Ligand binder design. Structure first.
Ligand code: SBA
Length: 212
């Protein structure tokens, strides 16, 4: 695998979304990977529906956090709709899936990256973006604003986000707090500190969609 990886220059990642009061992170996380895997496969980049997972995942908790591996499972059974087709309201409203017609895309599977292992997490990122979790409950993360983030932060992972790249001493992360946070909505969390947990918890749970 290469030294550097930045999915954005491969035309495989879309503009930074904001999630608002909703604990929709999981959806926003799972969607970045789907958008990426498909462009990687097909050749076209299209925004997908976070609101769709948020409303149709029976195993998550709507605006009260959820499990990106279940939402990612959701898009494996049925599929996902374009973003304009089923736009983001930011409140959980009933499952308007079928009532919208035929899904925009569907994936072959979901998967787990061996946890607490910064190496597996790099093999994977070098194929397509991946769902990753961390800790943002802290003032430092909330107040981040550029440069390589090192902390301080615990390992009490809450927030869900996506990894769209890496370099020698950082893992490029796409977060959903707008473009007026971090590096235009992005954050470069440092890697290679030996910590088996990863900075802020970055290696506690990682999943990605399979697409033949
Ligand atoms: C008041 O914060 C308490 C928290 O725990 C929760 C986090 C939860 C998602 C785990 N809230 C936040 O992090 C807030 C609010 C929004 C943007 C999510 N984020 C935030 O303030 O960062 C965005 C920001 C951007 C530019 C200037 C100042 C702040």
């Amino acid at each position: 695998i290469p030294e550097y990886v930045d999915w954005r220059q491969k035309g495989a990642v879309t503009p930074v979304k904001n999630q608002g009061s909703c604990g929709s992170c999981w959806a926003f996380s799972a969607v970045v990977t789907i958008e990426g895997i498909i462009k990687i496969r097909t050749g076209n980049l299209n925004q997908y529906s976070e609101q769709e997972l948020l409303d149709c995942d029976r195993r998550s908790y709507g605006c009260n956090g959820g499990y990106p591996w279940s939402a990612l499972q959701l898009v494996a059974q049925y599929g996902i709709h374009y973003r304009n087709t089923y736009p983001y309201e930011g409140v959980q409203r009933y499952c308007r899936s079928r009532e919208k017609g035929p899904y925009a895309a569907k994936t072959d599977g979901v998967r787990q990256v061996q946890p607490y292992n910064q190496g597996a997490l790099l093999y994977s990122i070098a194929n397509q973006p991946v769902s990753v979790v961390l800790q943002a409950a802290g003032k430092d993360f909330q107040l981040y604003r550029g440069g390589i983030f090192v902390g301080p932060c615990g390992n009490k992972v809450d927030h869900a986000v996506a990894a769209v790249g890496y370099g020698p001493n950082y893992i490029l992360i796409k977060n959903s707090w707008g473009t007026g946070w971090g590096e235009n909505g992005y954050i470069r969390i440092k890697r290679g500190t030996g910590n088996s947990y990863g900075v802020c918890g970055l290696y506690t749970s990682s999943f990605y969609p399979v697409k033949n």
